[PDB]
Write a protein that binds this ligand. Sequence first.
Ligand code: HEM
Ligand code: HEM
Ligand SMILES: [Cl-]
Ligand SMILES: [Cl-]
Ligand code: NA
Ligand code: NA
Lengths: 713, 713
Amino acid sequence: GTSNRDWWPNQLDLSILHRHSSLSDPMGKDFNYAQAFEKLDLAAVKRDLHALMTTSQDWWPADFGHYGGLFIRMAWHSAGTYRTADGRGGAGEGQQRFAPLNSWPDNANLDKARRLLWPIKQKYGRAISWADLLILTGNVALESMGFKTFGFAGGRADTWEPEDVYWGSEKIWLELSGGPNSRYSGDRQLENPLAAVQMGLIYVNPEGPDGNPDPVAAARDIRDTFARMAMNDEETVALIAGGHTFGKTHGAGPASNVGAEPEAAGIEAQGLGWKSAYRTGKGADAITSGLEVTWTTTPTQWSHNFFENLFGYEWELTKSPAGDHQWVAKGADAVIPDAFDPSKKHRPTMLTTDLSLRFDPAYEKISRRFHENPEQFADAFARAWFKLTHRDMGPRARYLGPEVPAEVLLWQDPIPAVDHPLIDAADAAELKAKVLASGLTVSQLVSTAWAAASTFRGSDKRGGANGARIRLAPQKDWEANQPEQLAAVLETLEAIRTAFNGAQRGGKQVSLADLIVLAGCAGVEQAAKNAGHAVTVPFAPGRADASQEQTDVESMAVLEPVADGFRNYLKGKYRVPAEVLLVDKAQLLTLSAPEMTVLLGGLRVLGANVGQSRHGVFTAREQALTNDFFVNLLDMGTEWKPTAADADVFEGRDRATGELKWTGTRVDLVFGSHSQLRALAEVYGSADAQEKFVRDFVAVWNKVMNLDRFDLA
Amino acid sequence: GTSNRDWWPNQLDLSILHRHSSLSDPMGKDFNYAQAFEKLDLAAVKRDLHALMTTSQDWWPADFGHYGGLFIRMAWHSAGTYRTADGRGGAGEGQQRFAPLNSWPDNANLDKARRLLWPIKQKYGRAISWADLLILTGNVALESMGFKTFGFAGGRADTWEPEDVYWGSEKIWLELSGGPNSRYSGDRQLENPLAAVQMGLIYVNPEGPDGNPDPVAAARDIRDTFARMAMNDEETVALIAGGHTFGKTHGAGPASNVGAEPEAAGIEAQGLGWKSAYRTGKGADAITSGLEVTWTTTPTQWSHNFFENLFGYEWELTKSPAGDHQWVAKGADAVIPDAFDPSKKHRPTMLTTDLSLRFDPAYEKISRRFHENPEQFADAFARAWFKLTHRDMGPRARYLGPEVPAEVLLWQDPIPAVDHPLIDAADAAELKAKVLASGLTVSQLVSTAWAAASTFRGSDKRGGANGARIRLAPQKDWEANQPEQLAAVLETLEAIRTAFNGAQRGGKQVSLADLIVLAGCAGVEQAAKNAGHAVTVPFAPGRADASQEQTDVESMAVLEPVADGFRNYLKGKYRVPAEVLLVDKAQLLTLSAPEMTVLLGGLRVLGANVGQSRHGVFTAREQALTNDFFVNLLDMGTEWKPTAADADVFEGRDRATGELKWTGTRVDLVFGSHSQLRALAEVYGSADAQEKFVRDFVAVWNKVMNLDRFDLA
Ligand code: HEM
Ligand code: HEM
Ligand SMILES: [Cl-]
Ligand SMILES: [Cl-]
Ligand code: NA
Ligand code: NA
């Protein structure tokens, strides 16, 4: 069937904003996963998982009699798709069970692992999500094998459809770099927001870059990809060596024996894939990656044998039975156990990427320290394993259950506890009036609260106005945030704050984070008053102020908005058209198309544009909350043409006289061009729509202000 | 960005079932368009529409000073996409304003027409939908030019994204037949469900079949496509001749002057397209189809001139200024007015397809009768214009406003009014006990009510259990309905009915339509009892019984289910895989994926399969309402393989012994294979789900039973 995407393959796609409807969700609209999970008997779940570890099924026999290595790999791949650039990927939505991830080559045979878990999932039902179960099972595998984990939090609710993620533009699985859709340019520069070297890999190629078995060059790719998953050198070494303490790779025969991935397989495969013609197709004959490496002498027990082997041998380049590059220990004895024949042993073996940990000079120093001090290795690995598996969960307020680590970690963007009474409705009224009486304008108030709140992304639940991190490095100096203007606003609000807090009794105080939001609420009310309309904007107190010492500045950099169409802002020129970037930002804000539309039309007339640009300010009553953006954009009396100077800036002239009325960007004008967005603009631009426009603007402003308010969840 | 569709282009698409969520809809979730429309000042709207007729805009100047012809074409194309096969297309959702229809070649410059209507749309806002406005406008155009219409109903609520329609598989606009994705095979047999000859045409090619200017062969295409739009010969002649009494075609210069269609146009085009480089690009210089034909001496007034011209001249094949085939009257004087120059006159001209109305022998007889009896022509055209424009609106109960024709028309599938007291809760309990005491089984009661109710399709709001048409030709003889079994159930129910009605006082009676539905309810209650569960199934009385004479047998044929996955039924072999057919049926039933899933799993265990097939009957307690379907489907103790005899029938064997446990079709097993479906099946197959499954089943069963209940709207 030919589709709109076939005919107009470059038209903007709004369907990413309308996923996750109540239509596709099998749970009722009142289901609350946290409420379910809080009553789960987590101990019982863990005892069933522990038993599973050594209960082999004949359709996918357990290596060494123990599924622990398979389950560790499963959980590491569940988490391992995460990119810090956008927050997308990660284990937090259980997306490994859907396309495309369920059928990535790097996820081969994890269909088997998830199938092994169906009995437990079935037993406990809605009280444990697949998302949570995949991570838990990796923890229980680690515990079963003698490794002490750092902890575990539940609360990842299941999803019901694939997420819309850009995983790259290649049309061939695993394509090597330098093709027509290459994700590399320049001197091996991986395109943002990608965090993997080839389409369908988690991070890097285990043979080496584009298959070249050089451990030093492989180290470069490990470092870059892991940094793009928010891990530093110590964490990276700890994770790789920790993982590879357990289990084995699978490459018993040629890869041409392996059939279709799950999304391509026949209906009778019942959701499994990679069926193999090689001998038994499983167990001793399994083929997963094509590599055939077993790292340690006790693949089912925590040890410090990975580093003992890595440093205790010299390594020779060899080939697996599938023809893939791997390494074997020179002159070694057969000391590694076979996975099924108790009378066979094997020489130590390594991947190219394992040897990176000894041949890259910076990794070698960490690896030596870990070899000499295995306690330090165990602690780093437990910490890194927790971070890997929790990095996309969001604020600690979302962590559920009895095994949550009490230690607050800097990567969590921690928010201090509130230990004092909160302002009430009358206090909030008093503060809104004090803010308006200070002389701060509607545009200042709206712009400041927008800047604070709109760092939130729903991909990994980072950002938002809680913390008042807008007053700290680096947010206070981001271009989009207009650093000098911002500092002036913040000084005025901090003086209101000090005067209000100094007058209270009883311990009551207001945080700066709450006052920033409240002040933006005052600005929105005042703009509505300026248009002739009395409205109250909802506000919920309870935000707290984080310190600079509780803020990792380097980690906060990925939250900078380099394109923010809601402020008509683009920090530089990108290949992706600005309208596409607006829909991307709206998805990370969790907005629907109607919410995006209302919000942007209102922001334009409120004065939220960076630099007070007139682009899209289609009103003669700026700082009044009216639907003038939509009425004026849709007026057929105005003709639009791209300027000579800049093809992405447009002049709006009266069609009869030629007189200049307005200017706009692509982000403004898309609302008059895209057929679905124009239809939305028409509802807000109609003569009956002033009340609707105000109410729906107030609703979406409050939604944005509350995106990180999981303390009210 | 490579997408799942790129990787697995033949995987089934469930997003068609979650279109039209509350996420994409800008109106609040309680907006009721009927209520808005009922308060519209329709007379005011009509006065504004009359004024617009002759208010020419310089960006698209009015032909003859009057936009009536353009607006009639606009309305006819809005309606013209309707296919009787699936009920899809038509005017009823205003889809001409969305892709792909806004950019079809046959809809060229209708973007202009719609833009002319924005000021009225803006003025009246939500109280008139685009969908209603496009039809009303065409009515006002006809009235303005002297033609009395048969009436008008409002109530077409707007939609907010494109509908998912199969329009064909060609990848080239306008592709002629016999290509790699030909919609024609055999002796000019158009593939169902298509109702147009080329991709991006409304019905037929105005030059003739594949561009060959043969009026006789064009007539054949006209007849077949119009019949696929529910129109017979008389209606077809009336509509073509009636339309072509007005306006003109546009082909002032070569088509190569015309630029990108709206979905391809630049952002500055602000939603318009087909900008032309020919001279002034508009008005006298307009290029729409490429043809240059003006049919009558008075193109802005109702006349009898069409048929005077068609019969009064002999016709010569010529070429328009764009090179396209058309006809000119031999030896005629220049009697047809020019659209813009009062000093220019033109000879009469005709399209190939207009000449079809004279050269096809059956159409000639109607055309002559219309030429000789103009009042017959006017009345037939009025009636046919009403049908055209209302054929997809559904039952009369949906018709709104002061201009609704009182006359009941056969094509409306009329349902008599209820003129007696209805059964109450005590009566419903008494009837359900009678039904259960008769010996009708769960399987029979469920199957019969399913058969009755599941004829409904939301595309054109035809079908459903109201009317008790299951007892009439042709429904009573459809194979999917199990005609012998059906007859036996109906006889039993009709005797219950007679006995109950004969005992009443006052006028109270129960219709057979109600009793069939109530009896299906009793069957579901009984199946719950058989599973150990108390359950209450909602029922709403008020259905009435239509007569055979109120049921057009040939129009009913398109409602026959040739594939009904819910009954594991496929009447023959189709090219489209059966699980795609199931999702298509779910879309017509208005079901989401979770409702399709629950419903099918329940139906399997209740005995609703045609012929009592065991395919999918994954329970040892048939006729008990349980979640067994899901629990057994998902049991990894079972291995599935296609049979030798039939690749579309699968055997489920115990994995350890080989013993046969079940058999299933593709429609059964897709719930275990498709990653999104399987995720849904897992929720219902979990150990905590029996109660959820029963309550969700009852809800969706009730939903189906009430799909056509617009008397309760
Ligand atoms: C440079 C980064 C990494 C590379 C290239 C990589 C590569 C792979 C490969 C190719 C396999 C074999 C798949 C098979 O044939 O069955 C695998 C297995 C495995 N990996 Fe990694 N790995 C990386 C990091 C990790 C990390 C971070 C962890 C966890 C902390 C992990 C844990 C495992 C485990 C436990 C197995 C064994 C699976 C089994 O016993 O079935 N790996 N690795
Ligand atoms: C065999 C079926 C039909 C064919 C092939 C056909 C073809 C066309 C074509 C090619 C045009 C010219 C487009 C342009 O260049 O502007 C057109 C114009 C138009 N048609 Fe038809 N037509 C059909 C039936 C209809 C019907 C059923 C109606 C309405 C009842 C209708 C009403 C009109 C009107 C009013 C115009 C004039 C538009 C204007 O003045 O701008 N036609 N027709
Ligand atoms: Cl994601
Ligand atoms: Cl449709
Ligand atoms: Na994420
Ligand atoms: Na329809």
